[PDB]
UniProtKB/Swiss-Prot annotation:
Protein name, entry field: Pre-mRNA-splicing factor 8 homolog
Domain notes: The MPN (JAB/Mov34) domain has structural similarity with deubiquitinating enzymes, but lacks the residues that would bind the catalytic metal ion.
Role according to the record: Functions as a scaffold that mediates the ordered assembly of spliceosomal proteins and snRNAs. Required for the assembly of the U4/U6-U5 tri-snRNP complex. Functions as a scaffold that positions spliceosomal U2, U5 and U6 snRNAs at splice sites on pre-mRNA substrates, so that splicing can occur. Interacts with both the 5' and the 3' splice site.
Location within or outside the cell: Nucleus
Assembly, per entry: Part of the U5 snRNP complex and of the U4/U6-U5 tri-snRNP complex.
Gene that encodes the chain: prp-8
Signal peptide range: none
Amino acid sequence: FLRGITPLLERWLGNLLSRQFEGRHSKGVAKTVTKQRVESHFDLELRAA
RNA sequence: ACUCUGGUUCCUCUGCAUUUAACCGUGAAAAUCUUUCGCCUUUUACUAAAGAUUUCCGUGCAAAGGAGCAUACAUUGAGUAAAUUUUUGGAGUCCCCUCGAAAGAGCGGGA
Ligand SMILES: [Mg+2]
């Protein structure tokens, strides 16, 4: 178990630490389109076209 | 006669471990993506199968450098040490006829 959880927590605790020290840069990351958000996204791209 | 090198043990770097039936691992994790099943008023954390990739705990060999211990020159690639029938301890010598200036050559002949 620990063999495989070691790199997973190394990444996760890295991400935890990095936003704890660097702050969270994530403003303007591309939000993806998902179940509820499809129908509003169709209306965006329709009205834009 | 030439150049070629001290044993061991350990550290670390570098390179290679794909023609896999199968196996660097007689052991066995986690993730991502794509798809298909089951949970479910959502997502996460999930179910349990396929396919494709990753990370992680490890493996082998070669080669180079260093560090500790006790100590030995040989030895690798290139290359050393029989008088009794079948070989290396003598069936060897000599003399006529032939062709040819020349010196050999005939299962030639003779002692
Ligand atoms: Mg919502």
